[PDB]
Amino acid sequence: PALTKSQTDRLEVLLNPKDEPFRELESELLSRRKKDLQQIYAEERENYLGKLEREITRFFVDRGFLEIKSPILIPLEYIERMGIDNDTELSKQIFRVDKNFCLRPMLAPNLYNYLRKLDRALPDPIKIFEIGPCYRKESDGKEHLEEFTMLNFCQMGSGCTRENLESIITDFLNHLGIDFKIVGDGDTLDVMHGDLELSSAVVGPIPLDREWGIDKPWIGAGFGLERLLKVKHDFKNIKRAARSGSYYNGISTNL
Amino acid sequence: PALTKSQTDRLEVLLNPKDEPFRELESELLSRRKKDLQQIYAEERENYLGKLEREITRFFVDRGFLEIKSPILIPLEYIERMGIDNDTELSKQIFRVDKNFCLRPMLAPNLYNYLRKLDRALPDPIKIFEIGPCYRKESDGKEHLEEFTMLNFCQMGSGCTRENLESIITDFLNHLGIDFKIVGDGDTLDVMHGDLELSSAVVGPIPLDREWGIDKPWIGAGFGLERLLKVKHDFKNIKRAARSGSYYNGISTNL
Ligand SMILES: Nc1ncnc2c1ncn2[C@@H]1O[C@H](COP(=O)(O)OP(=O)(O)NP(=O)(O)O)[C@@H](O)[C@H]1O
Ligand SMILES: Nc1ncnc2c1ncn2[C@@H]1O[C@H](COP(=O)(O)OP(=O)(O)NP(=O)(O)O)[C@@H](O)[C@H]1O
Ligand SMILES: C[C@@H]1CC=N[C@H]1C(=O)NCCCC[C@H](N)C(=O)O
Ligand SMILES: C[C@@H]1CC=N[C@H]1C(=O)NCCCC[C@H](N)C(=O)O
Numbered sequence: 001p002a003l004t005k006s007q008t009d010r011l012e013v014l015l016n017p018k019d020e021p022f023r024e025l026e027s028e029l030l031s032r033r034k035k036d037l038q039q040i041y042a043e044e045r046e047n048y049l050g051k052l053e054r055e056i057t058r059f060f061v062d063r064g065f066l067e068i069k070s071p072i073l074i075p076l077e078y079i080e081r082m083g084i085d086n087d088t089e090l091s092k093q094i095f096r097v098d099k100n101f102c103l104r105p106m107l108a109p110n111l112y113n114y115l116r117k118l119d120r121a122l123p124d125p126i127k128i129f130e131i132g133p134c135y136r137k138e139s140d141g142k143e144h145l146e147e148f149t150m151l152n153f154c155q156m157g158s159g160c161t162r163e164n165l166e167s168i169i170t171d172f173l174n175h176l177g178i179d180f181k182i183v184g185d186g187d188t189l190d191v192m193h194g195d196l197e198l199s200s201a202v203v204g205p206i207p208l209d210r211e212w213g214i215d216k217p218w219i220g221a222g223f224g225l226e227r228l229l230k231v232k233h234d235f236k237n238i239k240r241a242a243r244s245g246s247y248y249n250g251i252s253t254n255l
Numbered sequence: 256p257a258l259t260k261s262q263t264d265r266l267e268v269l270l271n272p273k274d275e276p277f278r279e280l281e282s283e284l285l286s287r288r289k290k291d292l293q294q295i296y297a298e299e300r301e302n303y304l305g306k307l308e309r310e311i312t313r314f315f316v317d318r319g320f321l322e323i324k325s326p327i328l329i330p331l332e333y334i335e336r337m338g339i340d341n342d343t344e345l346s347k348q349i350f351r352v353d354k355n356f357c358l359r360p361m362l363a364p365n366l367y368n369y370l371r372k373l374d375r376a377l378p379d380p381i382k383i384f385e386i387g388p389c390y391r392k393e394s395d396g397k398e399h400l401e402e403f404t405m406l407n408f409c410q411m412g413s414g415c416t417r418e419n420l421e422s423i424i425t426d427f428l429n430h431l432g433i434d435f436k437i438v439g440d441g442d443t444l445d446v447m448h449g450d451l452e453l454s455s456a457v458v459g460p461i462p463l464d465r466e467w468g469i470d471k472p473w474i475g476a477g478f479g480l481e482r483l484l485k486v487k488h489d490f491k492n493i494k495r496a497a498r499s500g501s502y503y504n505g506i507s508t509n510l
């Protein structure tokens with residue numbers, strides 16, 4: 001009569017935010033999910049994460065930011081240089097590769113290097129951004145992924161005010177159609193969606209800049225793309241938005 | 256009088272394929288490279304690798320292929336399951352992470368999983384592709400990167416003939432404007448540009464398919480994006496096309 005917890009878990013996997021006797025309930029949902037995949041295959045054919053990356057890219061390129069693609073595999077030394085010592089949480093979340101490298105847990109190091117180098121060639125202000133995979137060992141699984149995708153944009157030189165930063169964040173999220181609230185937490189702000197952190201943003205300069213050969217004011221923010229998708233598509237578990245073999249655009253592939 | 260080898264190396268770093276007393280030669284090139292970066296920043300602002308990924312995506316999506324984004328960090332078991340044992344070269348090129356995972360050295364495993372799962376929902380033929388980072392420990396540095404980007408497209412079911420495969424390869428490369436030759440090497444072909452391998456392609460089925468729960472004919476090919484850029488932009492060293500902090504769209508960032 002009553003559905004078991006395992007059966008309910010199975011049906012929830014097949015349930016989409018849009019949906020309103022077990023084997024019958026499962027057959028119904030399976031039919032609907034196959035139809036959803038068939039529609040995607042027939043029309044759009046674009047992956048949610050890939051498409052969001054392209055939409056975000058266009059937004060920043062159009063607003064004067066240079067598109068950067070830097071290494072995902074980085075020197076372990078960069079982590080130390082970011083002020084991440086055995087005293088912070090991140091120190092234990094690092095995925096090491098070999099004895100001198102790791103999977104980047106963030107985009108800041110490579111972007112610091114580009115701000116420094118580009119300042120020798122480009123007119124002020126320097127505006128750049130990168131979107132790409134970042135990695136962190138995590139205990140949570142409902143809001144955190146060990147493999148995720150970050151957008152980090154930044155500007156250095158003129159116009160690096162909290163007002164400008166909040167303005168870009170606002171136009172960005174209103175563009176994507178994602179509700180948010182900017183709250184305080186160098187000047188550090190968090191862009192929240194309810195109790196979910198969409199982004200951490202900062203108004204420099206900060207002491208850390210010296211280690212990277214940076215001596216100008218700057219502003220920047222990092223957003224997790226899977227969290228943006230999660231909110232936008234009303235996914236309950238972030239795994240539905242992740243690179244995966246288990247979901248395609250939020251639809252279960254175990255049909 | 257004569258330039259030293261080190262000085263020549265420095266000037267070559269600043270030299271672009273388009274270019275026709277050391278400190279003077281360097282000053283000239285530095286000025287030109289800054290101008291090139293300034294033009295990029297003022298107009299396009301798109302990264303070569305990111306843009307190529309977007310162009311390739313559009314090409315396949317438009318031709319009926321579903322865009323896939325799968326994990327870069329994969330189970331070590333996938334490597335074994337691909338028939339990569341301590342008897343092949345690849346076995347020693349794997350970047351291991353923790354005790355059970357690794358950085359994907361190719362896209363095939365995740366795509367095999369998608370072909371199997373999607374066959375339960377999509378009409379025949381199943382057409383999919385993925386573009387993303389792949390990793391291999393390499394000794395070469397002029398044609399090989401340890402961190403590179405692969406495009407792997409494939410079709411399973413109807414129309415999986417060598418003729419169809421060669422046709423897609425041909426339209427694809429003629430679309431990008433890259434000269435090539437298809438040569439023999441299940442049926443295995445190599446798409447060459449002079450002595451450089453652009454792609455390895457295969458007409459299935461093959462014995463390996465059984466391990467992945469695949470029992471239909473298929474065709475597929477894997478292309479390295481940095482090699483395509485290298486050829487298209489006439490870069491002598493592939494590092495000019497790689498994710499990097501040292502070059503931006505082929506222009507040195509050490510100015
Ligand atoms: N493990 C993760 N999975 C998914 N997204 C993440 C993850 N870690 C960080 N992000 C995203 O990246 C953004 C910037 O990174 P960061 O500010 O370091 O996050 P955090 O401080 O680790 N946030 P949190 O762990 O939720 O308290 C975060 O605001 C999230 O949007
Ligand atoms: N280390 C690398 N750096 C850049 N591109 C690569 C690398 N390895 C493979 N590729 C690209 O990925 C394509 C498909 O992978 P694969 O057929 O396994 O290459 P391979 O057989 O390793 N080629 P090669 O090492 O040049 O003899 C190759 O044809 C290249 O275009
Ligand atoms: C390259 C800039 C300067 C140093 N930090 C870079 C930046 O833009 N910081 C703002 C915050 C970004 C998100 C943060 N790095 C995180 O991972 O949560
Ligand atoms: C998912 C298919 C079936 C198994 N191989 C996948 C494929 O498309 N193979 C063709 C060759 C691709 C390139 C090769 N995997 C390489 O890394 O060189």
Ligand SMILES: [Mg+2]
Nearest residue numbers: 089090136144
């Ligand atoms: Mg955290």
Ligand SMILES: [Mg+2]
Nearest residue numbers: 190197199200
């Ligand atoms: Mg934060």
Ligand SMILES: [Mg+2]
Nearest residue numbers: 344345391399
């Ligand atoms: Mg090889």
Ligand SMILES: [Mg+2]
Nearest residue numbers: 445452454455
């Ligand atoms: Mg090959």
